[PDB]
Design a protein around this ligand. Structure first.
Ligand SMILES: [Mn+2]
Ligand SMILES: [Mn+2]
Lengths: 202, 202
């Protein structure tokens, strides 16, 4: 079944940009709740217990109506937060390089303009949701989704996401989401984003 | 123009059920932001500037296309928090009385049963939103809405509401929303809910 992934860094590694208390609660309680509920939803269906998260979220239409919403919300929660951890790093920040930077420069004109568009999208998502950079049939684009909806449901491959649920920033930033977004850029693991872009292109 | 209402009690008054810090921030920053953004969307539209919040939210389609969303979200936020403050009280708690008590026993069986299904409605609202006791053509019903949507848009009159945006409970309760839902019952101003129920029946 599905398992809570271990973090690749200590819970305080992202200070002062994300507080360790938030990292611990976000991971051990928010994320792990999504995993347990996801597993609970599929307990009665050996049909589905051997399918990847990507397969389930691409075939939401086919799942029984009794669990469709559970898989949507808890499967999305698991998929989104699993990606989130990997694209953070205490050694992150800076700018992308190589093929990825070249792709960003062509679609958005500059890395600066990409940051602005991504920050605007993250600030504009009313209520709970996520802001994404995705690969959509070989092309980069910025989008945002509500609640725990994953772009995989729309046939898009996420390579970078920013959780803008209030639980991701309230303890430290309270209502000041924009400076949580500003702080986010100092811990982005661009090497991981590039790896995911290299893989999504295929 | 619309203005941020004064609270009829100190920020200290609902302890230990709701922390003063949250009350202060919820009022002067979250709610205030909704009011200012509502007034800003209406600037340049003097035809809309003497219409009540109820009239605005009931005919969102009549509003121009470019401000419709701003009014739904910030108008809804203003209407919802305005009601929220009035149904909290340091002298609250207990059970309803009289007309409202009979209407609740009749429709839900008993105050305990109504509490149970109102608590589950509040807990089951995924993401941001509100739990409501509304009057719908003279009849009581429990419902919930996403984000800052107000049941006034559907033609229902809210007489009691519970804010379940994470900012409403995260500083004190973090992920434990049910703990916050349970504490909410100790500060409910049932007298206010009664006056509202009395007036919606007209
Ligand atoms: Mn989250
Ligand atoms: Mn609120």
């Amino acid at each position: 079944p599905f398992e809570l992934p271990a973090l690749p860094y200590p819970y305080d590694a992202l200070e002062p940009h994300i507080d360790k208390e938030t990292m611990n609660i976000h991971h051990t309680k928010h994320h792990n709740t999504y995993v347990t509920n996801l597993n609970a939803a599929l307990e009665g269906h050996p049909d589905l217990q051997n399918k990847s998260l990507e397969e389930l979220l691409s075939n939401l239409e086919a799942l029984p109506e009794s669990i469709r919403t559970a898989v949507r919300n808890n499967g999305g929660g698991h998929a989104n937060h699993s990606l989130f951890w990997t694209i953070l790093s205490p050694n992150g920040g800076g700018e992308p390089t190589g093929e990825l930077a070249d792709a960003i420069n062509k679609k958005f004109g500059s890395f600066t303009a990409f940051k602005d568009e991504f920050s605007k999208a993250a600030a504009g998502r009313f209520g709970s949701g996520w802001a994404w950079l995705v690969v959509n049939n070989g092309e980069l684009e910025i989008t945002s989704t509500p609640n725990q909806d994953s772009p995989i449901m729309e046939g898009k491959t996420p390579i970078l996401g920013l959780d803008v649920w209030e639980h991701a920033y309230y303890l430290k930033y309270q209502n000041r989401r924009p400076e949580y977004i500003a702080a986010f850029w100092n811990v982005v693991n661009w090497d991981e984003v590039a790896k995911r872009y290299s893989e999504a292109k295929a």
